[PDB]
Amino acid sequence: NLMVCNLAYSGKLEELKESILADKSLATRTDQDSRTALHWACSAGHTEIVEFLLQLGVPVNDKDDAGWSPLHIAASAGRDEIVKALLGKGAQVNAVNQNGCTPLHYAASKNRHEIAVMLLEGGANPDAKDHYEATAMHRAAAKGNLKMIHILLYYKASTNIQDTEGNTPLHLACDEERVEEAKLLVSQGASIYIENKEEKTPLQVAKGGLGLILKRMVEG
Amino acid sequence: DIQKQEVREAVELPLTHFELYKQIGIDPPRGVLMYGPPGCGKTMLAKAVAHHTTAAFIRVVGSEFVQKYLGEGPRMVRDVFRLAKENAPAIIFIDEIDAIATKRFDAQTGADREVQRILLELLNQMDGFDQNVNVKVIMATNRADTLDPALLRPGRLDRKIEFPLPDRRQKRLIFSTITSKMNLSEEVDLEDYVARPDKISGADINSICQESGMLAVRENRYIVLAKDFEKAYKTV
Amino acid sequence: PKGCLLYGPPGTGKTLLARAVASQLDCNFLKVVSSSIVDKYIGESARLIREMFNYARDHQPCIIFMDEIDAIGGSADREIQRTLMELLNQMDGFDTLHRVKMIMATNRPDTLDPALLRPGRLDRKIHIDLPNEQARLDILKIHAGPITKHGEIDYEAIVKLSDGFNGADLRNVCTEAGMFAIRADHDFVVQEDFMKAVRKVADSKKLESK
């Protein structure tokens, strides 16, 4: 609602750079959402603007009223150069937002391979949990991103994380009927004997006899 | 997705618009039953069918022929069936047969019995009109208890599609089709907003997104965020 | 003008004018509560404002009073701002407003949401201020009508000795002196009870004029 929202949203480069070089108050202006020009500039996809802000050394630990750091939000945007500059500065790779989802869940949600390799390369937890007790393989394996699963296999990601209901990534792969992904995770160590609060094995969660061929992938 | 997939396979394959069916008889069926315990459902499905199949659609409510003249039924099957077999193959949306599928005996409120005797009339008409007709009448409901064995006879309703409670597929793809047109944010995330409906049951997720648009058109915030998604979840 | 603002910072006096014409005909009646926003139950009062003002849209003539609007001029204030957005998107909304009318009243013009004070919506505003020696004399001559007086008439000491008031405080104080004239149960009413009783009772209203 402020000026830095339209200058940082509607595509103002020289008016915003002149606004920063003219008065630092506009550069450090916060709105009712507890956001700075970095949040709106990452919202509009401004590369050079956040390169100037991160160049001058803007505090990246600035969060909103919920706890959303620009690495969770901009990593939830799936932009290449934005995450290259944020990880170039070295932001908190394992900070907690309102729901607890680390930026790995957001790099895995948007199927961003380079953002996942660069987040997991800088020291991010490959098996971090949110408030819902779920990791990035529940959602990454549930959405249907096989290459994201493979690059999680590059970083030694666990396959038997218990959800808040008790489900595993194999339960979120059989519920979505991901054949090749459930065969891969089962061929990597997914236990077909883990039961959730519904008292149902992954053999009973899958449809069309897929738990029988997953058991075939267990015994063979 | 899977429901529109079974309906689509059960509709467009018999309606391939070839004259060779008239020689060897109408083998494939024409009636498809549906389900769905959200807010009466059965609307955005026919909306997507209207997006894909740019043809005629007889949009009628389930309680449209309850007029005291009792002649609206035969006039709609006569005129609508004759313009379907005569003009072009259409999709007649005769939905909500649960209110008109309940047994009734007393002649005081026996209007439902009279219109189910009209359902017997057209029930025999559709048997007499099994050959040489380009008609596709869909008929769905959302209750499996007030049904009668007459409608469940083979050759009339040959498909029985069920609907799951969370049904994460239609939820994810309805989020994709609601975010493909309306505005969105980078903070907007669907992970817990499609995983939580798997744990807790609900309805009208699209209308909940529209409620989030109502809480976002307040002009106090420029871009919708997740607080209106979760707040719209806890309110409605 | 589709909206008016009535701010009597000293005392009051708008309620007897809106009550004068509104009590006369008003052509209709519709009242909005100043505390109709607290909403102990779920925050779904917006559809009931759409229903109430939708009935106001159903009636072709309509005059709506919003007395003491400075309370909402400040999730306590969140739903207050939601009803304010109902005011914005229902005054500048989509409806034929060639016949409807509404009147907004307040107490102090300091906390009246200067974002709402933007013109166009609040077209009319009348500031009732210190005695200009004309409005107090007119309102005094029209309030002296129904009350009886003696041959001796005086008004300069009444307009001069009563300051910081309006026709409301002058009505309660003049009618108070008239109630002293019925406490004297005579067959005439000299203005001595008006000078001394309006003087002393007016001073008491200056002491309790907060």
Instruction: Give DSSP secondary structure letters for C8-28.
Output: -SSS--SHHHHHHHHHHT-SS
What SS3 class is residue C49? helix
Query: Which tokens hold the place of A179?
Result: 């054949």
Distance of CA B63 to the CA centre of its chain: 15
Sequence-separated (6 or more) residues with CB below 8 Å from residue A138:
A161, A163, A167, A168, A169, A172, B195
CA angle C184, C190, C194 (to 5 degrees): 85
Q: How far is CA A123 from CA A93, A116, A216, B78, in A?
A: 7, 11, 36, 72
CB atoms within 10 A of CB B51: 9
Distance of CA B80 to the CA centre of its chain: 19
User: Measured between alpha carbons, how far apart are the two ends of chain A, in Å?
Assistant: 61
CB C11 within 8 A of CB C164: yes
Residues C30, C53: Cα–Cα separation, whole Å: 9
Residues B155, C29: Cα–Cα separation, whole Å: 64
Closest residue in C to B211 (Cα) is C44
Question: β-strands C100-106, C4-7: how paired?
Answer: parallel
* Residue C9 labeled ligand binder: yes
Residues A81, A88: Cα–Cα separation, whole Å: 10
Place of tokens 């020696």: C133
Residues A101, B196: Cα–Cα separation, whole Å: 14
- CB burial class (10 A; 0-12, 13-18, 19+) of residue B88? exposed
Provide the phi-psi class of A34: left if phi over 0, else alpha when psi is between -120 and 50, else beta. left
Starting at the earlier edge strand, list the strands of the sheet with B57-60.
B57-60, B91-94, B136-138
Nearest to B50 by CA among B2, B93, B96: B93
| DSSP H/E element including C105 | strand C100-106
- Which of A137, A139, A165, A178 to probe the B interface (max B CBs under 10 A)? A139
Place of tokens 């009783």: C197
Rg over alpha carbons for chain B, rounded to the nearest Å, is: 21
Phi, psi angles (nearest 5°) of residue B16? -65, -5
Sequence-separated (6 or more) residues with CB below 8 Å from residue C186:
none
CB A172 within 8 A of CB A145: no
DSSP bridge partners of C64? C102
On chain B, the residues whose CB falls within 8 A of the CB of C82 are 218
B223 to A43: CB separation less than 8 angstroms, yes or no? yes
DSSP bridge partners of B136? B91
Query: Which tokens hold the place of C69?
Result: 């609007």
Which residue stretches of chain C are H helix? Answer: 15-24, 46-58, 78-91, 135-143, 156-161, 167-182, 192-207
Distance of CA B121 to the CA centre of its chain: 24
Interrupted after residues, chain B (C–N over 2.5 Å) = none
Alpha carbon of B207: minimum distance to chain C alpha carbons (Å):
16
CB atoms within 10 A of CB B52: 11
Nearest to C57 by CA among C37, C21, C28: C28
Strands (E) across chain A are located at none
The angstrom resolution of this structure is 8.9
Residues B231, B161: Cα–Cα separation, whole Å: 33
CB A83 within 8 A of CB A113: no
Sequence-separated (6 or more) residues with CB below 8 Å from residue B184:
B224
* Residue B154 labeled ligand binder: no
Place of tokens 């994709």: B176
The DSSP letter of residue C87 is: H
Phi, psi angles (nearest 5°) of residue A218? -80, -55
Alpha carbon of A108: minimum distance to chain B alpha carbons (Å):
11
On chain C, the residues whose CB falls within 8 A of the CB of B218 are 81-82, 85
Q: Name which of B185, B189, B223 is nearest A109 (Cβ-Cβ).
A: B189
On chain C, the residues whose CB falls within 8 A of the CB of B235 are 42-44
Number of residues that this document lists for chain A:
220
CA angle C134, C139, C143 (to 5 degrees): 150
Residues A153, A149: Cα–Cα separation, whole Å: 6
CB B215 within 8 A of CB C44: no
Provide the phi-psi class of C200: left if phi over 0, else alpha when psi is between -120 and 50, else beta. alpha
Query: Which tokens hold the place of C51?
Result: 């229903």
CB A202 within 8 A of CB A170: yes
What SS3 class is residue A4? helix
User: Measured between alpha carbons, how far apart are the two ends of chain B, in Å?
Assistant: 25
Place of tokens 């994380």: A161
| DSSP H/E element including A138 | helix A136-143
Closest residue in B to C86 (Cα) is B218
- CB burial class (10 A; 0-12, 13-18, 19+) of residue B231? middle
Q: Name which of B169, B191, B199 is nearest A139 (Cβ-Cβ).
A: B191
Q: Give yes or no for A33 touching B (CB within 8 A).
A: yes
Alpha carbon of A140: minimum distance to chain B alpha carbons (Å):
10
Distance of CA B192 to the CA centre of its chain: 28
The 3-state secondary structure of A141-153 reads HHHCCHHHHHHHH
Phi, psi angles (nearest 5°) of residue A192? -90, 10
Q: Give yes or no for C93 touching B (CB within 8 A).
A: no
CB B215 within 8 A of CB B229: no
Residue type, C15: T
Nearest to B98 by CA among B165, B160, B167, B40: B40
Residues C9, A83: Cα–Cα separation, whole Å: 57
The DSSP letter of residue C92 is: S
What SS3 class is residue C102? strand
CB A2 within 8 A of CB A32: no
Query: Which tokens hold the place of C46?
Result: 């917006």
Place of tokens 């026919």: B46
Q: How far is CA A102 from CA A53, A70, A120, B125, C207, in A?
A: 23, 12, 11, 63, 64
DSSP string, B54-86: -S-EEEE-TTSS-STT--HHHHHHHHHHHHHHH
Phi, psi angles (nearest 5°) of residue C173? -80, -40
Per-residue burial over A183-208, b = 16 or more CB atoms within 10 Å of its CB, e = otherwise: bbbbeeebebebebeeeebbeebbee
Interrupted after residues, chain A (C–N over 2.5 Å) = none
Phi, psi angles (nearest 5°) of residue B18? -130, 145
Query: Which tokens hold the place of C56?
Result: 């106001």
DSSP string, chain B: --HHHHHHHHHHTTTS--TTHHHH---S----B----SSS--SHHHHHHHHHS-S-EEEE-TTSS-STT--HHHHHHHHHHHHHHHT---EEEE---STTSS----SSSTHHHHHHHHHHHHHHHHHHTSSS---EEE---S-SSS--TTTTSTTT---B----SS-HHHHHHHHHHHHTTS---SS---HHHHHHHHHS--S-HHHHHHHHHHHHTTSSSSS--HHHHHHHHHH-
DSSP string, A35-75: --HHHHHHHTT-HHHHHHHHHHT--TT---SS---HHHHHH
Q: Give yes or no for A43 touching B (CB within 8 A).
A: yes
Q: Name which of C42, C82, C85 is nearest B235 (Cβ-Cβ).
A: C42
Nearest to A104 by CA among A145, A66, A65, A63: A145
- Which of C47, C80, C85 to probe the B interface (max B CBs under 10 A)? C85
Question: β-strands C124-127, B136-138: how paired?
Answer: unpaired
- Which of B217, B218, B233 to probe the C interface (max C CBs under 10 A)? B218
Distance of CA C138 to the CA centre of its chain: 18
In this structure, is the dihedral angle defined by the CA atoms of residues B150, B154, B157 and B160, taken in order, positive or negative? positive
Alpha carbon of B213: minimum distance to chain A alpha carbons (Å):
17
Starting at the earlier edge strand, list the strands of the sheet with C124-127.
C62-66, C100-106, C4-7, C124-127
Interrupted after residues, chain C (C–N over 2.5 Å) = 74
* Residue B110 labeled ligand binder: no
Query: Which tokens hold the place of B96?
Result: 């909500």
On chain A, the residues whose CB falls within 8 A of the CB of B187 are 43, 68, 72-73, 76
Residues B150, B157: Cα–Cα separation, whole Å: 10
| DSSP H/E element including C124 | strand C124-127
Residues A128, A101: Cα–Cα separation, whole Å: 8
Sequence-separated (6 or more) residues with CB below 8 Å from residue B29:
B10, B14, B155, B158, B159
Q: Give yes or no for A132 touching B (CB within 8 A).
A: yes
